[PDB]
């Protein structure tokens, strides 16, 4: 039959001066990247780079937290306070959820 159970998983990237290669959207100091959605997905990822090589990122995921950090309702500026950071590692809790949702059917 149906069964819907979302999983979470951890990204870890290079960080660099140049730039990690995906952005966030979502936060309060952001645009909504969801209409009612008051988080933090991602906006955009870098292709043949880290964010996209992983495989556990894709546009829309959202990050409920950062470096171990609860970042779910987390302002826009807050949660970078962690992306920005001069680290060479970033872990960010991705929440995968199991769309298969057919509305039409």
Do not use: M, W
Not at 18 to 42: C, H
Not at 68 to 89: K, N, Q
Request: aromatic residues 2%.
């Amino acid at each position: 039959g149906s069964s819907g159970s979302s999983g979470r998983h951890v990204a870890c990237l290079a960080r660099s001066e140049r730039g990690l290669g995906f952005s966030i959207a979502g936060g309060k100091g952001s645009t909504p990247y969801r209409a009612g959605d008051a988080g933090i997905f991602v906006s955009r990822i870098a292709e043949g780079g880290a964010a996209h090589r992983a495989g556990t990122l894709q546009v829309g995921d959202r990050v409920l937290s950062i470096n171990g950090v609860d970042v779910t309702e987390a302002r826009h500026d807050h949660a970078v306070s962690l992306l920005t950071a001069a680290s060479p590692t970033i872990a960010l809790l991705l929440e995968r959820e199991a769309g298969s949702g057919p509305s039409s059917g």
